[PDB]
Design a protein around this ligand. Structure first.
Ligand code: GN6
Length: 154
């Protein structure tokens, strides 16, 4: 009962690119770029695709950085989210009807306006650590329980 997702963070030495979703699941929040993995597509191909479609950027090298499973109480389907990072992009970010991308200084990451779990794992991502995580949600704002451990292999 888990569905594959990707999430991609474009992380440079002094800044990170986040996208503000204008509509649908996660609307109103800053987040990385991602979505459901498709039939006949690898997780990494999915990650690269999601980044292009949502941000307009071209990425070559994607690095695995974590796996997070999300549980929403009362929803049968679990989210199995494969998180990736990259430093090497091509293109300039594109604002669309679906997504407003913006760069953030690493000290000005807008956690109050991000999924609440980000406050836990994003500092690991920033210090180039790899992680396995699980977050149980009630609704979209409340973390009931969670586990988060660093790992050598994602
Ligand atoms: N950073 C982050 N934390 C969460 C928690 C629950 C769901 C989602 C989420 C919502 C929409 C699309 C995608 Cl790929 C994801 Cl991971 N995200 N994203």
């Amino acid at each position: 009962a888990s569905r594959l997702y990707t999430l991609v963070l474009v992380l440079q030495p002094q800044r990170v690119l986040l996208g503000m979703k204008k509509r649908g699941f996660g609307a109103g929040r800053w987040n990385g770029f991602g979505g459901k993995v498709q039939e006949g597509e690898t997780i990494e191909d999915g990650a690269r695709r999601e980044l292009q479609e949502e941000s307009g950027l071209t990425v070559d090298a994607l690095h695995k950085v974590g796996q997070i499973v999300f549980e929403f109480v009362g929803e049968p389907e679990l989210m199995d989210v494969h998180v990736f990072c990259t430093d090497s992009i091509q293109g300039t970010p594109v604002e669309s009807d679906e997504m407003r991308p913006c760069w953030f200084q690493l000290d000005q990451i807008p956690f109050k306006d991000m999924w609440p779990d980000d406050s836990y794992w994003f500092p690991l991502l920033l210090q180039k650590k790899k992680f396995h995580g699980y977050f149980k949600f009630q609704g979209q704002d409340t973390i009931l329980d969670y586990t988060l451990r660093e790992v050598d292999t994602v």
